[PDB]
Symmetry: C3
Subunit: 263 residues, 3 copies
């Protein structure tokens, strides 16, 4: 069960790259296949935090449900949700990652938000979000009506603050700015809180994972230790087989000595 | 030598969780056993930095001495050391981690401190400390008489600055705030300096480790490479045994051909 | 091909420690040998970021060219480039890392710089730079004529901001201050931009690597997974050999039963 992934990255699949037709009735898997140099991976350029840990941790998964965490129509009543660009153009139309919503202001000044979610799925929940990094102060003002903004994310067992870095970057996918991505896991009974006054790429969809019992915490360091441990056991088994055959070879030799003794 | 640890985490054992009766005349070990879902692990909720590296690095230890680094009675002459709470209640009495001291103000305004320690143990020293993160600005003022504080920690080969994040978190162990934990190692001849004007969970006890020669730097990446290297050697050994028996099987066959030739 | 490295660290070799005579016509290698406790490793005390990843990632390299990225004589027309100290004294003369330039002010106030490089080598480029951390505000003013400075580094796929920490550290190599080191990799077609208004240890030389096809991304987690995978294949091979010999031992026994039956 390597999954159906084609010329996509893991990030493209979970973020919702418009070009990855992976939104099918596919549940569990034992390994994830992805293309090292994908075409449908990155949609909008930026750094994906702890990518290696996420792709490693997700290597073994049971039930895999995609569900709404902060529904587009009701979660941000007076925010702009038409956060689209040429970067994610699909069939000629401007767009964005399906599981994310890039929020901007309208009419007046971009208001600040505070939203939360409680995990009642009896599954672990993977929440993805990002941080906007404008190429120029002019856009920081145009989008959020501010020269200063922060994003605060906390949860039962998580504390992080993000700040924007405003600078012109090398042109990538025709963009001068960047969007970085971050993620956390929630256990049943936990809560996540999002507070921001600008530059927030809000979570829309989240993944509820049963995961199963094929791993521990899921940290890549544990997954690798598991493989090594497993190998060590195979080595002891073969060592026993060696002693077994050495003994038998010994006995069979003895008879060769005797059949000879008979003549 | 797996150690005597019961329903405790490594963090609970080294931080001094009141419920972990591990303070006995126990020295060296070859592996640390701990409970994946402990009851006496976390005392006061928060994030433990580089936990995986610390538990991995400590997997092999020689002499293990617990000693005072900054004695409660003399290290902070005009600070409040009665830093206790319900979170660590023991036998009905409010308390805290045994190896840590949560400092607060009194009488006037919480003064700033600057303390240092020089490693003259001829052993490597593990120093644990934490950072307070109030649920509300009201408590930041009540405890340290400030709306702004920082913690600076430097050593021969370490440079880090911590800042508080003030926010209401999901309720964990009846707390709305958090305490994060950080740690460093000192070599013989080194020095550590602690500077703070608030939100410091000061070190009280520290551990002097001889460690031994069963590892290199102790980084988990090296410990795992050591295991792999060790396996590779076992593989070469068994491969030699295979060639040995193949040769002998060949010779024994030859005689089977001849004893047959005799008849 | 372990390389010619003697009593040097990897950092000393790539940073350009005056005492490491490694600047010879040496190209590719299959492993890097270094001294665990070197004399010619550290030149000026400080923390080297992601050292383990860099030494691991460079374990397998093809063509290895050292070239100028920001030539000393033309890249900073009105900056001081005589950034030398006793720490790197060579043959009695004050000096510094050969591949780095420590910039300071002169005449007037230290001006701010903005420099960039585009990778047109058809190779991946390793760029090394550092950040100055004065022991005292007095030196921050004396060197850069400021009480506040920042270093901004961005690239096609990199975003980081550094700030100075001004404090007196434990004396190491006769220094009270520190210089930290950071590094990035550029792919062909990428760009790196350096912006600073003080405390910049500028890049002078950079390394153009062909790397080869003996690894993937080069992250240490992948290099280790490769070794484990390789071992697993060896195990399957030996398991087949075991079945082979067990079958043959069986047949040879049968004849031993019959030669006996003949008598
Ligand atoms: C992936 O790219 C190859 C060409 O390199 C193409 O033939 C194939 O159809 C692509 N697959 C998908 C799912 O786009
Ligand atoms: C905007 O929506 C928030 C709820 O998300 C509400 O509290 C606030 O008063 C609204 N502001 C306006 C101008 O409607
Ligand atoms: C940010 O939140 C404050 C309340 O803490 C509110 O007064 C202010 O108007 C908000 N900012 C914007 C742009 O609405
Ligand atoms: C650990 O928990 C079990 C119950 O799950 C209990 O029987 C045992 O006594 C506990 N051990 C300690 C040291 O508390
Ligand atoms: C508080 O103690 C410090 C030493 O730790 C001392 O320097 C300072 O003067 C004392 N302040 C008062 C009011 O006693
Ligand atoms: C903090 O240190 C300064 C000296 O640098 C001192 O003047 C000030 O009073 C200290 N703060 C408090 C609350 O004592
Ligand atoms: C390394 O140190 C040893 C002494 O421990 C010395 O004999 C040797 O010549 C040194 N090698 C180099 C390259 O300095
Ligand atoms: C210093 O050099 C920069 C170019 O690196 C130039 O733009 C600036 O005008 C120069 N300043 C002076 C005073 O020459
Ligand atoms: C820093 O850059 C600004 C322009 O953005 C310039 O006006 C200022 O003089 C520079 N600082 C110094 C010390 O030259």
């Amino acid at each position: 069960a390597p999954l159906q992934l084609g010329n996509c990255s893991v990030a493209g699949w979970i973020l919702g790259n418009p070009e990855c037709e992976l939104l099918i009735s596919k549940e569990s898997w034992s390994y994830i296949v992805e293309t090292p140099n994908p075409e449908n991976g990155t949609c909008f350029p930026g750094y994906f935090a702890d990518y290696e840990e996420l792709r490693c941790q997700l290597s073994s998964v049971s039930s895999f449900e995609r569900f709404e965490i902060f529904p587009k129509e009701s979660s941000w009543p007076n925010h702009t949700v038409t956060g689209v660009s040429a970067s994610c153009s699909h069939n000629g139309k401007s767009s964005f990652y399906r599981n994310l919503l890039w929020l901007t202001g309208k009419n007046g000044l971009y208001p600040n938000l505070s939203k939360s979610y409680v995990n009642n799925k009896e599954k672990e929940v993977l929440v993805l979000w990002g941080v906007h990094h404008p190429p120029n102060i002019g856009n920081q003002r145009a989008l959020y009506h501010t020269e200063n903004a922060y994003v605060l994310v906390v949860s039962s067992h998580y504390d992080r603050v993000f700040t924007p870095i405003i600078a012109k970057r090398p042109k990538v996918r025709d963009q001068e700015g960047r969007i970085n991505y971050y993620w956390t896991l929630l256990e049943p009974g936990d809560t996540i809180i999002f507070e921001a006054n600008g530059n927030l790429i809000a979570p829309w969809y989240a993944f509820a994972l049963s995961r199963g019992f094929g791993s521990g915490s899921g940290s890549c360091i544990e997954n690798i230790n598991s493989k090594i441990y497993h190998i060590e056991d195979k080595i002891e088994e073969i060592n026993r087989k060696i002693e077994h055959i050495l003994s038998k070879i010994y006995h069979i030799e003895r008879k060769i000595e005797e059949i000879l003794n008979e003549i």
